[model samples]
Target: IVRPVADFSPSLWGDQFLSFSIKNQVAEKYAKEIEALKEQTRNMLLATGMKLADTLNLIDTIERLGISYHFEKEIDDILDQIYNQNSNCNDLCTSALQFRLLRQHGFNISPEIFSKFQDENGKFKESLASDVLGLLNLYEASHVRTHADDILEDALAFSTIHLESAAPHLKSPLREQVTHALEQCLHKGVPRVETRFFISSIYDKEQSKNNVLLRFAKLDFNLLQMLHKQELAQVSRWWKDLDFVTTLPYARDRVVECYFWALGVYFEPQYSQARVMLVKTISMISIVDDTFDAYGTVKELEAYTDAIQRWDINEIDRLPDYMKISYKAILDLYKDYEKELSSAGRSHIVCHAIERMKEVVRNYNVESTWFIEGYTPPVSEYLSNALATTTYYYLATTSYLGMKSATEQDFEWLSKNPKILEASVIICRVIDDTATYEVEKSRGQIATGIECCMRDYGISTKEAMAKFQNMAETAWKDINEGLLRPTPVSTEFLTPILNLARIVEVTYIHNLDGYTHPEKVLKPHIINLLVDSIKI
Candidate 1:
């Protein structure tokens, strides 16, 4: 009576059925609550002289959308009720759903609304204002109702459309309204990742205001435009004075997100400011991430601060010594990061960030380097860390390459550039080697450095590495030739890509020490293995 896994279609018995069941159950449970709220809103709208028919008809349209089963119905019913009762009505539900659906499917609703919101008079006429206010209010409420969802939606929207557009012009007051609503919904008590996504999305969209929406919408889009245009000197000065450690993770996350977005823009043409912002942001975040991971907690993280004002370390230390030992390892990690940053050269912000992180951990009153009776780094762990470090190093280098004003940009200016997709291939190859290392390590065979020279091309590490290396070499050659073939160019955006290539090359070459020497190299590859193992 049961179907095989392959035979089971979601359409037949998968998420479709699950969604249907879930929606129905939710509707049934919240049906009364939904209707009551709807009535209340309808009464309010009707008093404003909105036509009952129009209000009810829109409600009917919403019901037909099938999202009614999901808490979206309650919202729709309420909005309709409000519109019908008060000519003063706002259709908050409709706008919210429209915004949600547009984001879900990668459509731009702002431009559509902008077109609709404006009266034939080309001014903010009251008659045309009803539709605009209704829709926007709905959107604002929906954002507050589901901050995580809205944030994620906005982030994805920005990533795809930051460089492209049909900009949505948000009026100043309306923008503030939406932002405030979202801010209220976000509590420090919520999960950090969700907060990160929300903050990043908000900040990025705010930056691209001038591209489309601000250009026509007549909103204060200059807020973000000003940020983008901020010179390196300005950003540098701000970085020096800022106490990044005390900043909330969301704030740091926003800085980093903006930096990456700027990098993407810079890639279009050399934007020195964007590039500078990118480096400063990256350095700042790297330090912040290290501190939080090593010393901060869920509560402290929520507050977006460094110090853990809760629980005394002395009390924690009095617990089973093993527990104390575990805590010490965290301190050690931060200590190591601090030492690394102190000696890491002349980047003032970078060094300052590192020092701040060190202070955060030192202030925590926890022991450093605690190992319970026989806690040791597993060979797998050590190897994984090394591999991960290597991967991240390569990533960092690649990020720099993609940075505006880097050599890759120069190549683009000359109409010659190489694609740096090979880095991903090389990374995967390293990962495969990690897998093999795990098998050998478990067998009690100290991994031979020569084993790193994987030979099987189709399925072996050597083959994957060769593929990446070959791809890089070939691409570079092509780029060189292309540059020599004179062509007129207007702007350059290839420097970052080239920088990425160079970094990848260096990292790969340095990583070859595994092939040449056999000191049981433990790279972040082992961590990847463990992480993958858990996912399974």
Candidate 2:
């Protein structure tokens, strides 16, 4: 019998604490002011006629502050101009930043631009090591390196070592920047909401900082934060209506964190509806996962899986009391999604999303069997099933369910197991397994990648871990390759896939599974993104 190992409580904030009402007059006034500031900022970016380095720095600042969505056209035009010009960046920082921005925007800039920084030994010149800012930028850029970019691999190692040693000797903002980058580089850092708070503080201390830009960033951040709060409040009410805490106390109580994860996928105002739908869907999935992993017996899970596969409420009588609630919650959420999509003339996408959800539930049932039978499959078998259990493919497909830019073809393309989606699955599976291996084993959970690798390769735990770590790195390359120019789908669709991987990195980077134990890492992030407002 699989007994519950943990019982999580309801969110401390509750629905009352999360509720917020914005006054129309105040909101409209801020909106108008924000638009005026945006126009002024646009004029500044255009009229300044800045050098390539300055222009790139401004772009970086705007992005870090989470306002880049407003200036997409202007930013793209500037980058296009820079890309067409054969400007020479005489400094390491300038060259690395320029190259990163270009490549990140899908511009096919050659990585060979870093060749000038190398000495005769094919190593980055040791003399450049003293330039800490340059090394930091180079370190940030190295993460975007593809498999063929061995030179960048070296640069990553070199910059990391020197930056770690150089951090203590630096002062104030620079020191903090170095330390944060070493901890989590810009490439894989938390979403822009958290990054902007730290960056805004850092920029405030600079004597030469643009007051106009700084003011605009602060105002824009607060205004957006208000909007996010309103969104979260609505979702909190939905979560409260579900009443999972009383009915399904064995599951993780993380509606707030679920919303935060959806926000990471896309924080723009346009995707608000998608975010709400995604968080509700994922929240129910977490409950279903708990039922399979901890609460349900083998036979009950089999029945539940069958019920999910049928996708009918009439089958609810076949489930246990706890599972009856979980099944109905899932069906109800999907019906809501169907109605939302129907309004947009995209009702067909919900069927595709529900199919993926059925696949995930089916995989969870498979894992439940592995646990009950005390069977440890080989790595290959375990991985194929584990990818489905990752729920990323479902999350990714569902993320675009009602998006204006997404079409039925996008959902169909995703169902084919696109490279980017698979890459995300690999990253999510390996990192999560590595972080939770011991905890899972103690709880009599199903075999993870680590256990499978050990059983298949006859390797020690250490060796299996090392091998899986390498595989995660290789998967990152696949993710990078998927983002290259001439992509199979528009970047609009591919971005949520990429952002899903980024959020995975943020969630599991410290060798701890934040989702399982939110108090340790995720709590702080929740406070940063949701509780605390940026001080203007």
Candidate 3:
């Protein structure tokens, strides 16, 4: 029979998120207020003068408040205007902000812009250490650095040490801000997740007259949360119909968690449908993952993999009962996607997405084969195979599936296994192995990449972890480099790949598997984003 189906963790969030819809009155009121506030903020943005500092600071505030998405073209034009200027970006904090915003918006500004802050000794000036605001900006900016930006690397190390010492001595807003940065910087944070903290803890506290931006952002967060809740409810209802609890009891019941993962990928309002489609796809993948991990035997999986090859309904006759549900769900989901997207002129993406789906099933089957055979694969082979087995490459490709703006050319770009995609998979795979190693050890699960690293390098477990963590860091650098100006695809398409990596940080930070154990971290996130709304 099956390898005594591993007792996976059950979904902590039950049917709570199902069937949520709010009054359009609530939405319409929010829309009008938000529209007025946005126009006011737009005025402030266009109110920029010879002082690039106001331009920088207002742009920075809107960005931090999570309202920047509303001002894309408006902000881009001002940033374009700033990029053309060669002013002496003299103030320490101002200079840091300029560098980050310009580089962040893909203007190709150098990290070396801060060398002016450096002493003749080439170290950031000793006095700059006391400039906590400047130091904090430096810390945030340095996070966007590529591997070759040694100065940024140095800036990270230096600001971190100073900021840690400075954290205790600071005051409100500044105090918590410094502490928060040390915990999680601006660059690596999931935009929507960080916006909540930025608004409640920071923005609300510093509220004042003409605070239209604050009102707008708070309302924005609540409105989007409801929209997201509605989407989750629909997805939740669909999942309930599938009734995986009874049909595939061994598989993990994580419909809520799957939606959260999709939200992490793209939380903007426009991505609502995209998020729903993504949640369905990811939930199905979770079923496939769990089935291959424990419920299905090598022989059964071989049949399953063979069935996936042709994607024909007749193949289901060979699959076991549980596999039939997953198989049909996968095929039907793609069929629906094709019909929806074909009308949107993107039917071409279906085959590309399926090809990656096939790769994932094939890789999982290979790993399961290793588990059955008691084989310890070489690190080289494991690393390459680990890429697809993590399912990130497939997730990254499918993320762009719903965006009408995502062209067939974008899908073609993904098919090449671009650096950003590879880097994201590396982060997902390596962190996943390191995070889940203890659980895997207790279960006597198949050897992970961590084990392969240990076996290949002849190092201690702790040492192997260090190596893997460094590789994750290097992979992050690859992602940054891939996101630079002159990208292969538009940054719009690249963002989900980036956001996928960001979720990996959330799900696996501190070497803990938050996805598997949501109570540990993700529960609060879910409640914050989908459960509670900021009072208006």
Best by lDDT: 3
The local distance difference test score of model 2 is 0.83
Per residue, candidate 3 scores C-alpha lDDT tens digits across 470-506 of 9889998898888888988888998899999999888
Error of 1 at 421 (Å): 6.0
Residue lDDT tens for model 1, 1-536: 22112211111111111111123453343454445544544343345554544544344332222122223445444553443333322243344444433322222233233233335543322342334435333333232212223222332222223212212455544454344333332211111112222232343245432222112111111122223334423443444345342342222222323233233323222345335534553544444444333444433333333222232344443333323332343344334433433443322223232333333343222211111122233433323332322233223332333233334333333222122223322333343343345454453433311132342222365554454455443454333222221322211332333333333332233343321121232122212111111110
**What are the per-model C-alpha RMSD values against the true structure?**
26.4, 1.7, 1.7
lDDT to native, each model: 0.33, 0.83, 0.85
TM-score of model 2 vs. true structure:
0.96
| Ranked by lDDT, top first | 3, 2, 1
The CA root-mean-square deviation of candidate 2, after full C-alpha superposition on the true structure, stands at 1.7
lDDT of 2 by residue, 319-352 (tens): 9888888888888888888888786788778888
TM-score for candidate 1, please give it.
Answer: 0.23
How many angstroms is residue 315 displaced in model 3 relative to the true structure, after the best TM-score fit?
0.5
User: Comparing candidate 1 with candidate 2, which one achieves the higher lDDT?
Assistant: 2
Q: Candidate 1, which ten residues in sequence have the lowest lDDT sum?
A: 8-17
In each prediction, how many residue pairs overlap at the backbone (N, C-alpha, C within less than 3 A)? 47, 0, 0
